[PDB]
Structure 1
Amino acid sequence: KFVSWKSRTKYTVKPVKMRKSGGRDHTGRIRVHGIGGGHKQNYRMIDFLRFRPEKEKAPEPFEEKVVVVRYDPCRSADIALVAGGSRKRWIIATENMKAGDTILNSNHIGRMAVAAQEGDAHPLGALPVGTLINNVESEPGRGAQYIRAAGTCGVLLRKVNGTAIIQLPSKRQMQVLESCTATVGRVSNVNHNQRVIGKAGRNRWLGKRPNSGLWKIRPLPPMKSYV
């Protein structure tokens, strides 16, 4: 009987109503423990492909205007509404974004490095080595999947041929083609980790249930004596 709420087919900026799970599969059995309740929330669709040219428009760099920087219940970072041409869409907001700023989305792998301003999206090859980045994309055209959390940044360690080495926040190095976009700058809410929950009731608001009350080297035959 369970039907997923993620059924909308068309992008929009209007908030969408969410249904909670409780940690239960579509069968109806618990699969993840510690989930339940919390405040009602609305989903705002985030577009993670920064360089999406508008309809019936050629693929060259374009600019957009920052309308708002807003709090989001569904993430640790904060989001910004940005408008360009005749289209509006949500995106992630960098550390120092302010309302009214203009930002650039580029498709040009400059033969020489392109001067980088926080928040603009460029192919990884253009940026100079050592420049912090976030919202990294593993494959060209896939959409950002890494380093999209609050206060987290990656580093472009090296570039050889058409492949670059990125240092993820965990410090595990990774490699990708140089034709996949990335946006410069650290993610917002640098001080997220400093929060103090304070009282048990606050965790219940976030949708977390309490833990449960309930409270291997086999020796070889010559090791049995001194076990």
Structure 2
Amino acid sequence: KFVSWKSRTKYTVKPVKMRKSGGRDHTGRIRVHGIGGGHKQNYRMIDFLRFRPEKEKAPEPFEEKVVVVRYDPCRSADIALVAGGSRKRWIIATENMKAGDTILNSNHIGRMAVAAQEGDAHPLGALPVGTLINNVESEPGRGAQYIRAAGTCGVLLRKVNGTAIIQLPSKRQMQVLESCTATVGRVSNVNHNQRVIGKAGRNRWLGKRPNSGLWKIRPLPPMKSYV
């Protein structure tokens, strides 16, 4: 009887009501422990493909206007409503984004380096080595999947030929084509790691059930009389 709530085909900026799982799967059995209850929430459909040209428009760099930078219950970072042309779409907000700012979304692969302004989306080839980036996509057109948390910025270590190396926040180096689109700057809510829960009830407000109260080298034969 479990029908997923993620059944909306068409993009909208209206917040969408979420049904909670409880750590259980479509079978009805717990698959992850420690999830339950909490505050009711609404899902605002984020758009991680920064360079999405508007319908019936050409594929070239465009600009959008930041309406508001808002708190999002469903993620560590904060979201910014951005409007351009006749389209409104939620997006992740960088560290310094404010209302009324203008942010560029560029398709052009700069043959030379392009000056980097935080919040604008540029292909990795355009950016210069060393620039802090966020919302990186693995393959051109996929959409952003890495560096999407609060205050998490990766570095662009190297660009050679058609590919570049990205240092993910975990210090794990990844390689992607220079065509991939990465947003510049940090991801905002840099102090999220400084937040203090304080009381056990606060985690029960975020849907975190308490931990359960339940409290390997086989010797080789030649080394069993010394164990």
User: Normalising TM by the smaller chain, what interval?
Assistant: over 0.9
The alpha carbon displacement at 1:188 in A equals: 0.5
The alpha carbon displacement at 1:221 in A equals: 1.5
- Please tell me the root mean square deviation across aligned C-alpha atoms, in Å: 0.6
The alpha carbon displacement at 1:24 in A equals: 0.6
The alpha carbon displacement at 1:225 in A equals: 1.3
Map Cα deviations across residues 137-163 of structure 1 (whole Å, 9 max, x no partner): 100000000001001000000010000
The alpha carbon displacement at 1:124 in A equals: 0.2
Counterpart CA distance in 2 for 1:87 and 1:219 is 66
Map Cα deviations across residues 97-140 of structure 1 (whole Å, 9 max, x no partner): 01001110000011111111000001101111000000001000
Map Cα deviations across residues 50-92 of structure 1 (whole Å, 9 max, x no partner): 0000111111100000000000000000000000001100000
Counterpart CA distance in 1 for 2:181 and 2:218 is 51
Partner residue, 2:6: 6
Runs of 4+ in 1 over 4 A off after TM superposition: none
Partner residue, 1:136: 136
Counterpart CA distance in 2 for 1:71 and 1:25 is 29
TM-score by length of 2: 0.99
The alpha carbon displacement at 1:217 in A equals: 1.0
The alpha carbon displacement at 1:29 in A equals: 0.6
Partner residue, 1:219: 219
Listed as ranges, the gaps of 5+ residues in structure 1 are: none
The alpha carbon displacement at 1:218 in A equals: 1.2
Partner residue, 1:191: 191
Counterpart CA distance in 1 for 2:7 and 2:111 is 43
3-state SS of 1:88 partner: strand
Identical residues among aligned pairs (%): 100
Counterpart CA distance in 1 for 2:175 and 2:101 is 32
Listed as ranges, the gaps of 5+ residues in structure 2 are: none
